Amino acid sequence: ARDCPLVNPLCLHPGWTC
Amino acid sequence: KEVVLLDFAAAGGELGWLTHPYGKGWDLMQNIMNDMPIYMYSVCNVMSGDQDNWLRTNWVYRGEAERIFIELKFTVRDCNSFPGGASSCKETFNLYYAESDLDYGTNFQKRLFTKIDTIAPDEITVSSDFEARHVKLNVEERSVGPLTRKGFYLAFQDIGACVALLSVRVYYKKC
Numbered sequence: 001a002r003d004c005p006l007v008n009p010l011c012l013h014p015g016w017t018c
Numbered sequence: 019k020e021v022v023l024l025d026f027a028a029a030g031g032e033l034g035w036l037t038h039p040y041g042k043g044w045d046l047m048q049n050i051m052n053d054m055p056i057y058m059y060s061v062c063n064v065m066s067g068d069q070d071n072w073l074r075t076n077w078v079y080r081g082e083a084e085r086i087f088i089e090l091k092f093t094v095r096d097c098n099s100f101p102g103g104a105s106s107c108k109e110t111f112n113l114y115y116a117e118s119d120l121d122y123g124t125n126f127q128k129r130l131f132t133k134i135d136t137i138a139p140d141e142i143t144v145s146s147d148f149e150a151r152h153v154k155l156n157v158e159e160r161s162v163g164p165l166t167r168k169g170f171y172l173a174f175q176d177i178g179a180c181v182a183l184l185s186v187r188v189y190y191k192k193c
C-alpha cells in the first residue's frame with residue numbers, strides 16, 4: 001500500500017515504482 | 019587512478035541488495051528521466067516509532083584494494099516539514115561494513131557489521147524545495163581499511179529518517 005511521504009522533489013516526476 | 023568496485027547509480031537496479039525487514043523499510047524506486055533509468059533506495063517511516071531498517075550491498079570482491087573510499091549522494095527531509103510529523107523523525111542514518119571470506123547469502127547478520135560513521139546531511143530538503151522542483155543532493159565520503167579478507171559488504175541503517183540514496187560509489191586508488 002505504502003502511503004508514506006515523498007522523499008525528495010524527484011518524486012514529483014511521475015512513473016515511480018517500488 | 020580510481021578503480022570502481024561498486025556503483026549503485028549505474029547498476030540498472032539489478033544488484034540484489036538485501037533489506038531487513040522484508041519490504042516495509044528500505045525500498046528500491048525506479049523511474050526513467052531524460053530517457054535514462056534512475057534508481058533511489060528510499061525510506062521515510064517518520065510517523066511510526068522504533069524504526070530499525072537495514073540495507074545490505076551485494077558482496078564485493080576486494081582484490082588488490084586495501085583502503086576503500088565510499089562516496090554517497092542522498093537527500094534528507096526536514097523533520098518539521100511533515101504535516102502531522104512525529105518525534106520519532108531523525109535527520110541522520112548509519113554506515114557500516116563487514117569483511118568476510120564467505121558470502122552470507124540471505125541471513126542478514128547485522129551483528130557482524132562494524133559502524134563506519136553517522137551520516138549527516140549538509141543540505142536538508144524543506145517544503146520550499148518541492149515548490150521549486152529542485153533537489154538538494156548531499157555528497158559524503160568515508161574511508162575504511164586496511165581490508166585483508168576476500169570481500170566485504172556495506173550496510174545502511176535507518177532509525178526513522180526520510181532518506182533517499184541516489185549514489186553509492188565504492189573505489190580504491192591505484193597510482
Ligand SMILES: *CCC(=O)N1CN(C(=O)CC*)CN(C(=O)CC*)C1
Nearest residue numbers: 002004005006007011016017018062
Ligand atoms: C515513502 C516512500 C513511498 O513509498 N512513497 C512516496 N513516494 C516517493 O517517495 C517517490 C519518490 C511516492 N511513492 C511511490 O512511488 C510508491 C512506489 C510512495
